[PDB]
């Protein structure tokens, strides 16, 4: 009767997966980085710590961040004083905020992506939801499904407690979902809210302090699919390959623990040095098979974990000073939004390329690379193809 | 130069994903269910609550569970008295146990699966790790990678805080990973440790009490891959399709929150009734395309959330009394091991089928169905194809 070989050929999709739409959203309130050290040491009641404040001023001035959007307001902090301490029990209060706000912000981003896409919500077949802020059952994927009114039977993948590399991961995931399933349209959402990590300062833990200087909130959403319907859907970027690796002997370079005091962060040794030392190996594995050896001929998307990472990668690889313009722009305007960052950078890049009338969505270039960096020292490497503009 | 269309055709695999190996592992200590009511009310210092103890006795006697394996021993509870209270802050103590024990147990199962597979560990290209017990960064996937000595560059998917349906989810995930990537061999691990949910009894929360009667520990591992190398690798079950849906108007049927007191569980209304009312719709969606309408002609794997779910599905669908033998056997010998359960049942089924000299790994039958049930009231439905013996 029926053969699994024929079933398999019919159920799989045809060509490479493409990003068909992008949307972004942030909390309403942006705080200027120039103002943040005064603000932070005030609402954490740490004005006594003059030495520490001077270090944090340097951190914020060095961050190359102009502003960040933050769900956490002074009013919310007044209501939650255990969140303001370096270490006070506050996991429940932080969860109460984030289990609601993460899918809410994610919905805002998704609605925008779906608007650009222009297709009925009912055509979405898959949902990949990613966050590093909070956990619950059922998860944020379920909540977003309900908020948006997606079909029941949407195939969901809930990616919790992922960390900063996961912008690459959700792309790796959506690629396989879209390419292996003929009519698949994958909604991808990364939604990040720093209420789970915000805390007061400790002179014993300066690395936690740098986190307070860098992390901001935001959500990004994509529609990903193979075999775009002509005249109706329009690819923006196509995916070619997606890799992931653990950088050698980088054990506790970036750690995060979910405790009674919320999510703690540890950031040790030469994270910028570790990434810079190793990144060319990931470049070569990705591009040597394509016959590409000049990395300046690529359009670049890198997770802006901090400006020192970008600077040292640029110096190591010998990138022209403007290659990381898009990445530095979202670092400047949004700060480090963990997993969502890299997707904001894709949006920045295709918008700027259009306004500057480059020939393609990737700054006029054909091939590009997207990097996520995060705990494990994990690096995600996605090879992208631009589309003619 | 090179065209992405040809690259795509070369980089994807040919046939359907197959389970190539199965391994399981449990903590060393099993507690007889006949002894559990006395034990539990003793170590939680609740012997005063005679009324509640009799209720719990009814629960354990009704559970159709003979024993469970438990990482938590009386010695560990004595060292962690805040875990024994119904409500005491204890998340840190539970995380400390589970962030270590979950990948440790997973490694045991994985080593067993790899032994059966018989191929070098270095041939593993992907790792899907699933747990509902604890979260950390980097995750249990990173830890398992380090424990097993997998290649860096193994492509990892860390599935946290998933719940009891996730045995289905990891199959759904591994299917797309294996089928979309030509040489891919996917290590799948589900590892579940109930130290995160163990707590004392409360007459105000009887639904928490049923969890104390049902949940046990365990880990299961699979190797999944397409295009098995003939004479070297041996498919056990092949995957045909994988679906996921949210049962209508089942809102708070199964909830779990991760709080300062650990993981709390809420289990409301007629979970068995909700599942039974809706399950034929998932059967029909899965099997109508294959021309199959007699659900007794399938080999069955169902998540044993409780014996009432099994009994009511059986009655509703009109299943022969022996169809759920394999599922009921692992319920009896292991209890409810959340996401790992369904994988233990696959192992039971193919082992029993072999010892009974049935014509196939699925009790002599060609087609089968695997169900995962969990929060959202989510049901995962996987269509399986057995292999000749």
Residue numbers in the entry:
A (entry chain B), B (entry chain A): 1 to 389
Manuscript text:
CHS, the best studied plants-specific type III ployketide synthase, catalyses the first committed step of the branch of the phenylpropanoid pathway which leads to the synthesis of flavonoids. Enzymes of the CHS superfamily share high similarity in their amino acid sequence, structure and general catalytic principles and function as a homodimer (monomer size about 43 kDa) which contains the conserved Cys-His-Asn catalytic triad in the buried active sites. Briefly, the biosynthesis of flavonoid starts with the condensation of one molecule of p-coumaroyl-CoA (derived from the general phenylpropanoid pathway) with three molecules of malonyl-CoA, resulting in naringenin chalcone and this reaction is conducted by chalcone synthase (CHS). Furthermore, a previous study also showed that the reaction catalyzed by CHS can be seen as a three-step reaction which involves transfering the p-coumaroyl moiety to the active site residue Cys164, decarboxylation of malonyl-CoA to an acetyl-CoA carbanion and extending the polyketide intermediate.
In conclusion, we have successfully isolated FhCHS1, a CHS gene from Freesia hybrida, and examined its biological function in flavonoid biosynthesis. The gene has one intron with an open reading frame of 1,170 bp encoding 389 amino acid residues with a calculated molecular mass of 42.58 kDa and an isoelectric point of 5.74. Multiple sequence alignments revealed that FhCHS1 shared 83.55% to 85.86% identity with AtCHS, PhCHS and MsCHS2. Consistent with previous results with other CHS proteins, the FhCHS1 protein also contained the three important catalytic residues of Cys164, His303, and Asn336 (marked with pink background) and two highly conserved Phe residues, Phe215 and Phe265 (marked with blue background), which were identified to be important for the formation of the active site as well as for the substrate specificity of the CHS. Additionally, the malonyl-CoA binding motif (marked with yellow background) and a highly conserved CHS signature sequence (marked with red background) were also found in the FhCHS1 sequence. As shown in Fig. 2B&C, the crystallographic symmetry of FhCHS1 is a dimer of dimer, with the homodimer as the biological functional unit. The individual monomer consists of roughly two domains with the active site located at the clef between the two domains and the dimerization interface, therefore sharing the accessible substrate binding area with the dimer partner.
